Nucleic acid binder design. Sequence first.
DNA 1: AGCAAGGTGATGCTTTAGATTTTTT
DNA 2: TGAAAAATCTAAAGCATCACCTTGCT
Lengths: 1140, 261, 261, 261
Amino acid sequence: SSVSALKRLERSQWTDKMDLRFGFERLKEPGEKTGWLINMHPTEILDEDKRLGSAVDYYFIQDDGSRFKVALPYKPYFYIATRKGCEREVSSFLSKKFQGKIAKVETVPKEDLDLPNHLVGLKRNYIRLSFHTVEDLVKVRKEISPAVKKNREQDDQLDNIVDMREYDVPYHIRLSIDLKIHVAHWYNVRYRGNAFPVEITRRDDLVERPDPVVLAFAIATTKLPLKFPDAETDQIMMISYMIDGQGYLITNREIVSEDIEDFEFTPKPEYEGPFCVFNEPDEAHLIQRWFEHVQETKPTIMVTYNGDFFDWPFVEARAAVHGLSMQQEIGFQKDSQGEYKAPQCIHMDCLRWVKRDSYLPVGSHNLKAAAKAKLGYDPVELDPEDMCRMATEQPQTLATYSVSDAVATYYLYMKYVHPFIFALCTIIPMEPDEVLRKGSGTLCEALLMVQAFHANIIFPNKQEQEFNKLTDDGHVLDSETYVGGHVEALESGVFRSDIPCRFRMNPAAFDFLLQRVEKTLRHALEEEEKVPVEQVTNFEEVCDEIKSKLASLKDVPSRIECPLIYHLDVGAMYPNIILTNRLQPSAMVDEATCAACDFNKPGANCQRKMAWQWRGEFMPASRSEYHRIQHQLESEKFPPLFPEGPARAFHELSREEQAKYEKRRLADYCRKAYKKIHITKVEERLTTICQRENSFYVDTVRAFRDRRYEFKGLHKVWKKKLSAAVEVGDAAEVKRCKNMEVLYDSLQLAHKCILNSFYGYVMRKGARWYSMEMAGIVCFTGANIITQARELIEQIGRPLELDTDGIWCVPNSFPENFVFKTTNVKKPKVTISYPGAMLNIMVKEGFTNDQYQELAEPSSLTYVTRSENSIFFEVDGPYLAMILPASKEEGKKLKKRYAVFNEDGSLAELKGFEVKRRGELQLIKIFQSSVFEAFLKGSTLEEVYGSVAKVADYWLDVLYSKAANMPDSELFELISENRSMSRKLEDYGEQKSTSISTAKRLAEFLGDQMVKDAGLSCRYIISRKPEGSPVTERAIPLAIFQAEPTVRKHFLRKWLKSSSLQDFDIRAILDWDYYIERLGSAIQKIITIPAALQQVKNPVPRVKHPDWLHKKLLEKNDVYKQKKISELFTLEGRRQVTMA
Amino acid sequence: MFEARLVQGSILKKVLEALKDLINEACWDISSSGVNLQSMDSSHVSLVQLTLRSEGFDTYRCDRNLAMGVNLTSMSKILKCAGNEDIITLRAEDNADTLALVFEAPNQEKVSDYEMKLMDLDVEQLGIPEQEYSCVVKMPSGEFARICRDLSHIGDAVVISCAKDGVKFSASGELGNGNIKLSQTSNVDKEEEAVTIEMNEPVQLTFALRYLNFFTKATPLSSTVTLSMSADVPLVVEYKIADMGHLKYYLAPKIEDEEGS
Amino acid sequence: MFEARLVQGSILKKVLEALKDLINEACWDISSSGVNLQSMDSSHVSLVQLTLRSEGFDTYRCDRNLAMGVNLTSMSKILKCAGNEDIITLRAEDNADTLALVFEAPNQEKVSDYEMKLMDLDVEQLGIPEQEYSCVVKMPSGEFARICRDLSHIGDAVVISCAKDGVKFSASGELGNGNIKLSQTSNVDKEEEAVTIEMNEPVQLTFALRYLNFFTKATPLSSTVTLSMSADVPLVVEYKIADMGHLKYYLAPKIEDEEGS
Amino acid sequence: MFEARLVQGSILKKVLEALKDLINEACWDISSSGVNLQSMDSSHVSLVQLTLRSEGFDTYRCDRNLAMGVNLTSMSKILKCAGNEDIITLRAEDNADTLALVFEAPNQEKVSDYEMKLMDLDVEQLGIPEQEYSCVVKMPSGEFARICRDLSHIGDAVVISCAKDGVKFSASGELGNGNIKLSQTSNVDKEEEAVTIEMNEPVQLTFALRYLNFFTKATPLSSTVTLSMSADVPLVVEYKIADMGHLKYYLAPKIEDEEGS
DNA sequence: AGCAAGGTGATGCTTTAGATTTTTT
DNA sequence: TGAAAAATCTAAAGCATCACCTTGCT
Ligand code: SF4
């Protein structure tokens, strides 16, 4: 008790001292200051009672440069629920038994969201209880929780407590929920003294953000060859860090060769780094120089790239070896989750944002690719293998590498993640670093807690996963999910606006799209442009123009015409569906509690019956079987799970291990008792959305959509103002408008990310607002929209690909866009898209919710019904080209792989072709990079294929000629496979892999030193001489080819299992068949199979089609067309054969 | 109510396993002329018309026409639960859901009673006109089944040509191509082995072959079969179940597409 | 150091193949009286007793009692080497964890000497009770195999009705329902196909039929099968291994007492 | 031009059934002495040869020395057309990719023709040495197939020991280890059933086992197999027919390398 | 002398946890 | 080289499906 309290006080005093030494002076005078919030940290303070007290320390920076720090105490609390009639008795008992532990307890009437008949205004009297410390919170929560769990499983005064809420809410989160203190806002802080609490108020008059002191650092180490840099055997050889655009660089003189002078790095004119260099003799002096310079500069933001796992720990280890610890001199520690965070400065690494919010493909998360994509320049390339050699030959290239990595991480912080994270966290109530760490689900949960505290409801607990729940007919479900939509390629090949395509159309859809043209244009003008249809001049002209186009297209339903590659993408389809259908996590209701309210009247327009599709896997055992196997299980005692205890009683082991044991013991019974072991049922369910539910979720999503729209508008206005500013060329207004423009761009980006995260939050396992029903409903409504669009474009053209978000689809005579002259002075011209408008009226007829009820006033419980449909399509222009490859696998595991080329000839988009950083040959990567730019040559289809097969011809000519005209170094740079070893080689046991084989070859080549520590890097080729042995067993390494000749000859004698060969050159022993096989597979994926599926002869004759192609082409896409009985034989008619 | 009696029960098992493979939706129709089946497959390519008349059964009585919508997705197995030569009795009730099947062993010891349930299915009906025939080729069933299984490995499309020399069955594909020519019999007197042909004009035409593979599950049903084709006329395969009943398989033809003209 | 040799070797293959798929881990009780094998499945439902008395062996040599832990997959795969009518021999050491099996061809030319390792096994013994049964029936094994394979896909569980008129095999499922009735056969001169029924009172039992399909696998072992059952009594499916031994499958009847959801 | 006529066409089907699982495309050459197939398998471990000589065929007509490469994956499955008595006409043209087959049943009515598409082949020729073998054993092929199939499940390798007592096989694996003894019988009147030996010194060898299982599918081709082996030589296994010639396999032994040393 | 049919060998489509294909050098 | 941090991969385990000639015998 006392020992923990004194340790907590010691930690608080140390954090206060460390805060003071970097400028964050604790506010100890009565007065008022203004500030900008930079961080917030749950601490302990002392009050006038000199007792335990929890608080939050808010750090502010002022515009003049000075910084301060204030502490505000607020007692954390949670909520209990008890049965009616004994609330006061439970309150009195809980006060008198937790004597000196509960600060205050009181009954709060708060509105349940899941309560039956809660829409009239029923409210439940919860009990708030608050504690002085977070540790007291945790202890009392742990003491109450067994009683709550026992009561909630069976259905003293602890039996009266039936339910318990708000226990996983963090403390600083709780403060930012209550007092509405989000960071990156300006505040007045008024400190009267220790008696009255501090007063903090928001200031909306100042909008301009200040500039905090930021330090971006990177290190270059000493690396043992073919081994990852270890902390205990190496040392830092140089460190480079930027502060506010000023460079600094410290080099270790015991490792480097000659001195380096002050120099500038400038990749682009907008990126300027002047680096001044200090040259410390030994590594301890390097650490002392870095620590002293950080202490002198006093930064409140420390940023790196993947520092938490590589940059930060290495420096901590080297500081701890050399005596002076890193925590006492800077402030960083590993904390608990492996996160290096300080109590005085926010630590950010750009890798978390690159993974989460950059929307970069997987495999492009490295800082080289991320800086090429975002910043627009490629940094300098230097492989770490020959990096230790640069410490001696010349250190100029290594200095350039380190300063380049520092510039990259600094400007990737300053340009992208700084305004994004400090605009995202004005919304989410977390800390800036906390927003950076965790996934979007917890951000969305925190936001919904803001909006649900504003609505005065209580927060549902996190979704505890039930283990093996029994479905409605009694079977034990070992898998339960919703049928989500997938991607499928309806046609594979090249589709270019120049090459004509064959269109087979029906004219029934042309009658569908002829008399409805006037309604099409009226609907497209009514709310999509908000233009009344009376002030137009050429309405009848454009209507008769569409009639003439569709009548010219009418008489020829089958034609050969040029395509118009469109991307009908619905504009954030899933939040639009949630807004349209009013899907809330408590809106899905069942008749057991839907009938218990007072609005289930005859003729009530309140329900919405919406269908979804459910997917379950379950054992084929009934209720009686599962009950009897439980009764057989309870007749015997469980074995000890671990050898640190005796056999387990029924209250001893936990739920998950007994659930796994029951799963196994039912599986090995139904293996021999029933034919099937896992029955999969994909059924069609239907649930009722309550359309007059408490609307905090829906108006949160709608307010965020509206705020995204208004921030996009402000961003466009300020972008125009910025263009005018850089045209006139002033100084103050240019920087002011640049600051405003980046503020609004960051805010709309944050709103877009949150809008995308709302859909992903509900399906998250363990989410507070968890809904499998919403996931199924939104996926089925999205799939229904994609299906009806598939029918609508499939009848008038060819849908190339069906994605989960939209349709890539396709005639040259089809109407594209039309301009309307309007008498309005604000919009003289209106540009409208007919393919967008026809889908708009299709979803207007189909998915418009005509029963969308909103509470107009809460006095007489009056609900207004309205017709709302915000689901709109978007046409992404007539793209020049689209290339779809073909894959062996068809189903839900198909990958979204295609390449779409803009009209100007660039790369509009490219998906699925993510080249792996080391897991692929260089041959495959260069072949792909050439073939994609090669598709756009030629005029007709055969010229396209014969000009895109030149890449395959060239590389098959290189590999068929044994690379006889190839230099040796690039032959190894192209052929070789790089690969890693994640953990210990010997711990795997005796299992076969090519990494295992080459690791064993390297171990027997040069000692056990290459296996002594993990993280081995292996570069290997595959040889042909040991015929018969598998692919793994022929993985000779590459370190042999640079070694002395005698050991190379000895181990090539040994490994090839031969002692009679003469030539030991690389061309002689190389397994060319493997490389031909994999390059031919890539050719088949990209060039050959799409040419076969387009009635085109094989462009590369050396690569042969697979047999499944030769059966699929005959069974699906033949030159002929199979007939039907009804075409060539008489029909008697349709009759209904009912049961007699 | 309807009664059917059959002394040796192999042939009903054989026709039902013939109808198993290609048919999922079936509609038995009973009238004064016997039992009839007019069924269209779910793939919308082929057709089947089966008929067992009144005099084939031993004891038979039909009050009026009744339609039963059986489902041959999983139905022939309950008949597959029987022996070979067992006496089979069908009992159809006026409005009850149970079709009764009685199986009697030849030693009058092993009896068996089965019931069949019915439900509601929808079907398109196609009336069969009678028209001047043209290309008839009568063959043994075993030879036709063997040649169909033979050509099944070559490709999925079959070429049928009748000419003065005889008849020719062919297929083609990536593996290659294969033709087989059969001429008329001259110096043989046994009826079940000889082949014969009726011709009006030499005809070259194409059909599908997987559906013919589904047609050839009637090898022990009868020793005789006839193939019947004509220009722009669906190929009908006729099995004559002794002097007891008959069965028609209709298959849609396959011609070239004159897209350019 | 157990040594036994028998002139016939097919019956060991038949017994072991019958015991192959049903049980995996088995405890072979070895004593002077013969070979005993009582065990259960991993599902703890099907029980097997197997007795091979010493008077049927050709040459026998025993030392004392032995506890054995053989998994039956091992020898069930080994004994595919034994011929149609070869000489079988099993050999065990006094204190070794291996078993030797010796196969002699009838012409004394092909000699096969296999041996195999072991694993320690623990089995909870369950001795059967001796009580008088009501329904004891002796049937041919082939027709029992036929009717079980017929009813296997008809439903899941069978209902057996025993009365003085005979036995009734009823089943109901998604395909409908059906029953097979077998009566007494007295007018017969031979016994190996003669069905006979012995009765105390009419009974109505229900059994899960997957376990009957597992029990059916002993069809070539014996030409007759004896089913013994009463109310709340496990089914006893007894086969007689020649005049020397007997194999009994005990099956807990499936009660399926639903609680009305 | 190349013409061949064969009336015992089942042996070619047996050859392709034996070789369908080992090599996917092989090499044939035609000369005045007949057809030879001397090819390396896919894993490049051992040599196989067919010797289909001139007078073994019923009618042979060859014009010049030639070599062709025929994929087994198509011709093996198209030779499934025949039963056990059909007769085969084979033609290989001079400069035509198509290879022609005609197929006559013995009923003098059935005639068929097929065409094959060929591909180029580049396989290095390995020289054929004639070396003496110390131990030659000649045993019926049925027991050879049985012993290989019965040692198939023991492990991945086999041990052969030829000693003055006779021949011993051995195998080992996780389920156990077993050896097999074969002696000599010299009091039988059938040479096809008789085993015989000739020995110079005892032989100890180790060999692949599943690969011998793969080459024990040529058992219906011939009733007697001869095995010849000695120290540090490939084992020769041959099936010789009383009328037709010999099928021969050279199998290289295992590496026999001490991994520790 | 081939049928009932199925059964173990092959083959193709889910699936679900953690290593790996991912960061840092 | 440690890592769950974190959500996208992906490869071993999973399970459904095809396939014909081999144990009794008509
Ligand atoms: S849908 Fe209507 S009846 Fe159902 S809970 Fe909502 S208001 Fe009540």
